[PDB]
Amino acid sequence: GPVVEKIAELGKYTVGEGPHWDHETQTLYFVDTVEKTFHKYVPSQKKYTFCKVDKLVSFIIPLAGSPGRFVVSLEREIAILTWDGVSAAPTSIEAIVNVEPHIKNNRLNDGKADPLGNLWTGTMAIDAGLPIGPVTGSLYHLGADKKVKMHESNIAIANGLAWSNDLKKMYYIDSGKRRVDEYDYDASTLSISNQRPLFTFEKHEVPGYPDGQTIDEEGNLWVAVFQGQRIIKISTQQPEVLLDTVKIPDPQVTSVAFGGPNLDELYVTSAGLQLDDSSFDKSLVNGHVYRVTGLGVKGFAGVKVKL
Ligand SMILES: [Hg+2]
Ligand SMILES: [Hg+2]
Numbered sequence: 001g002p003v004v005e006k007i008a009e010l011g012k013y014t015v016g017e018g019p020h021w022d023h024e025t026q027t028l029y030f031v032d033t034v035e036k037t038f039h040k041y042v043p044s045q046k047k048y049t050f051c052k053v054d055k056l057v058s059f060i061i062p063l064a065g066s067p068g069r070f071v072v073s074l075e076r077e078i079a080i081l082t083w084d085g086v087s088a089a090p091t092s093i094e095a096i097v098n099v100e101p102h103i104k105n106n107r108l109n110d111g112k113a114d115p116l117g118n119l120w121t122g123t124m125a126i127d128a129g130l131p132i133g134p135v136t137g138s139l140y141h142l143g144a145d146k147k148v149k150m151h152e153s154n155i156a157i158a159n160g161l162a163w164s165n166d167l168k169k170m171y172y173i174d175s176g177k178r179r180v181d182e183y184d185y186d187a188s189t190l191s192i193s194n195q196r197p198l199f200t201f202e203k204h205e206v207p208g209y210p211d212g213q214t215i216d217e218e219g220n221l222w223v224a225v226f227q228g229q230r231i232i233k234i235s236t237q238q239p240e241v242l243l244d245t246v247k248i249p250d251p252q253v254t255s256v257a258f259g260g261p262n263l264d265e266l267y268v269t270s271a272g273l274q275l276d277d278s279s280f281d282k283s284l285v286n287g288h289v290y291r292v293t294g295l296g297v298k299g300f301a302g303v304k305v306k307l
């Protein structure tokens with residue numbers, strides 16, 4: 001039995017999201033995708049800080065080679081933020097590229113570096129809905145030439161990403177599809193192909209929607225279940241295998257990242273935003289951050305964006 005601990009020091013988030021563990025500094029970064037804020041937590045020293053901007057944000061990833069610089073999303077722009085990690089505002093903002101300059105009602109959502117340091121991220125309608133709503137999103141990667149490439153389209157809610165330990169597969173979540181997809185990934189050309197469902201929620205009586213995900217060193221996926229009050233562990237060796245379920249007190253679990261000095265603590269974000277048609281009463285929906293220990297696996301440190 002794992003132990004789930006609420007991290008009291010951190011408070012409650014409207015939509016806590018995009019956790020990233022920087023192993024060199026033993027620091028957890030994450031966002032609130034509605035409150036327009038970035039967050040830094042240093043567990044060993046019990047230090048917490050935040051930063052404010054005036055656009056919607058969805059990820060924050062340290063830039064390789066440049067301490068104090070971070071690649072972030074600002075609505076539809078991918079930008080570099082220079083930040084001292086403690087002041088309430090960045091020192092400077094440099095825009096890299098607007099991925100969808102003429103689609104005014106879209107925003108970036110989940111994003112992550114692949115193991116080579118390429119940023120992958122997807123867009124969605126700002127007013128996307130569950131279970132049905134506008135489907136306007138696409139999946140991109142950003143090349144070290146600051147030019148974007150599109151890999152998938154017709155995405156409702158661009159969400160969790162992960163890659164296999166051998167760089168042969170990519171895993172991807174469009175929350176609106178209520179499944180986890182797998183793709184063949186060609187690291188040489190950064191092309192994906194052969195889209196196939198890996199895990200379908202309806203086949204296993206799993207409530208809610210897949211949101212963020214990460215992979216452990218045994219190659220298993222850990223998937224946050226928004227409106228399922230849980231994280232699930234699924235196999236990548238064989239389709240449609242549910243390995244384990246860990247209940248999280250917050251119903252709107254949003255994402256996951258391994259961290260801690262041995263990479264065997266799982267940090268879990270959630271959302272306190274109370275939605276129309278929730279399966280959960282308001283008193284339950286808080287938006288805390290959790291630490292899960294005793295899972296018996298390790299994960300990997302967060303990869304920096306090379307850019
Ligand atoms: Hg910040
Ligand atoms: Hg910041």
Ligand SMILES: [Mg+2]
Pocket residue numbers: 017110159160211212254255
């Ligand atoms: Mg998400």
